[PDB]
């Protein structure tokens with residue numbers, strides 16, 4: 375009943391806004407932003423439909439702002455490995471699952487800038503290293519800066535770039551198991567990367583209290599599937615694939631880590 379995710383990407387892409395959007399989603403029936411400068415984690419226990427879930431989201435500093443960005447992935451990778459390390463020591467000492475705190479990163483949400491072009495070399499290098507040790511779901515950040523047509527065309531280009539550079543992204547096609555896993559996973563692969571919009575403000579729209587971005591032309595409703603694809607990301611992580619992500623972390627990624635220990 376513990377689920378951990380991490381937001382990764384260049385600064386100025388709405389990452390910290392998206393962390394708040396996740397905890398503030400109207401889907402939960404429970405209770406409860408400068409340029410982030412170091413890694414810090416926020417933990418809140420949310421209740422979906424009577425089910426209890428301790429959700430931790432780790433927010434990260436950006437990269438790519440400097441002239442030389444070499445090794446800018448080291449803090450993030452260091453965090454992911456230190457959670458694998460801590461878990462191995464705990465499994466050795468206290469043997470039972472019920473008593474081991476799981477701080478392992480079960481999914482990384484990687485924020486791609488909405489350039490409309492294609493994946494930058496910097497993002498390719500970062501993605502190729504993250505997928506080597508963690509689940510990665512990429513998203514088109516701040517996607518309201520593109521039109522509907524432009525999001526779709528940009529999604530396809532990125533999907534092509536991922537294939538060219540062999541970046542196997544979640545849901546990885548090799549781990550498709552049962553007959554109809556693919557029938558539901560291909561529908562998700564076709565949508566990934568999700569074109570997401572983040573909001574930490576509530577607005578009253580036609581008698582409805584919704585999360586949204588208030589602009590001069592209207593309110594962009596981030597939980598409205600006609601406005602953006604945030605509900606797909608929110609449901610993939612928390613509702614439909616939470617267990618599948620945790621299974622892959624523990625059985626593949628974590629087991630691959632102890633091959634060096």
Ligand SMILES: Nc1nc2c(ncn2[C@@H]2O[C@H](COP(=O)(O)OP(=O)(O)O)[C@@H](O)[C@H]2O)c(=O)[nH]1
Pocket residue numbers: 384385386387388389390391392407408409410515516517518519570571572573587
């Ligand atoms: N247009 C648009 N702006 C956003 C979105 N999410 C956040 N912002 C704005 O982007 C700026 C930086 O957002 P922030 O959450 O700090 O991103 P971070 O630097 O990655 O942590 C702020 O002015 C936000 O209000 C979005 O989905 N669309």
Ligand SMILES: [Mg+2]
Pocket residue numbers: 389390391408409410433434
């Ligand atoms: Mg931030």
